[PDB]
Design a protein around this nucleic acid. Structure first.
Ligand code: ZN
Length: 252
DNA sequence: GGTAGATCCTGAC
DNA sequence: TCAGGACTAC
């Protein structure tokens, strides 16, 4: 899931778990647990805590309990569901939080790429994976000025810059390619080669593209098909190690 | 320090 | 054979 989907999860999951008290935590793929490194310590500390809130930072979910916060990233295919402890688990369920009311919060992930970190609330923001996280793309903290500062200071491509979590929080591949197309900028351009006008325009399209989503694709996954704006075949290459889609006519 | 590289894991080739 | 987000060593 991408940022907009993660926000939808935050909104819809919260009422389904708020005020419930953890009675058990069951872990079927320990690699997912990143802190405490010992999955048994992870499970033990959460027991007896009540869910008080659920926040999002970038593509991370932050479950707020009594003492601790649980920081969760779903990566490509992770998913949460709330269901009865009386029913069989779905395939690829790797972590389960059991509540005193007989319901469960279940984490599934076919690829097993997702991560979980637990810390005392007051420490969560200054430890990985939240430490160093850039500003929310939809917040005043993410400004053309901030983007300009990072752009001028690097030798990397503009695509690499946008993919960097320290630059802006949770801006995914699909939105990078769509934003660059909408801003008329080739993904392979050196970030420092962008004019102030290009930076401004890119910031604007980033906010609009992801803003629209949180509430129709031009290039992403459209290789070999005609550009919706000029009819030129969309091309796909690799930029910053990622599948990268662009129109060689609309983007410069 | 900035930056590439390595890394996980398995469905779809 | 390999893409895909967010500690190590060049
Ligand atoms: Zn075009």
């Amino acid at each position: 899931p991408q940022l907009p989907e993660v926000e939808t999860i935050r909104r819809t999951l919260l009422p389904l778990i708020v005020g419930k008290t953890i009675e058990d935590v069951r872990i079927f793929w320990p690699n997912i647990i990143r802190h405490p490194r010992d999955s048994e310590a992870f499970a033990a500390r959460m027991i007896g805590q009540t869910v008080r809130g659920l926040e999002r930072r970038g593509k991370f979910l932050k479950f707020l309990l009594d003492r601790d916060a649980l920081i969760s990233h779903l990566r490509m295919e992770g998913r949460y569901a709330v269901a009865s402890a009386l029913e069989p688990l779905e395939p690829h369920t790797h972590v389960v939080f059991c509540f005193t009311d007989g319901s469960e919060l279940r984490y599934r992930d076919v690829r097993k790429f997702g991560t979980m970190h637990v810390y005392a609330k007051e420490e969560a923001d200054r430890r990985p994976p939240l430490a160093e996280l850039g500003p929310e793309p939809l917040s005043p903290a993410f400004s053309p000025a901030v983007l300009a500062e990072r752009a001028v200071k690097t030798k990397r491509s503009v695509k690499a810059l946008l993919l960097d979590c320290t630059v802006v929080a949770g801006f995914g591949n699909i939105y990078v390619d769509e934003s660059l197309f909408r801003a008329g900028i080739l993904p392979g351009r050196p970030a420092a080669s962008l004019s102030s006008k290009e930076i401004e325009r890119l910031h604007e399209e980033m906010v609009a593209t992801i803003g629209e989503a949180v509430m129709h694709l031009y290039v992403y996954g459209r290789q070999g098909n005609p550009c919706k704006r000029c009819g030129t075949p969309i091309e796909k290459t690799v930029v910053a190690g990622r599948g990268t889609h662009y129109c060689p006519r609309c983007q410069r």
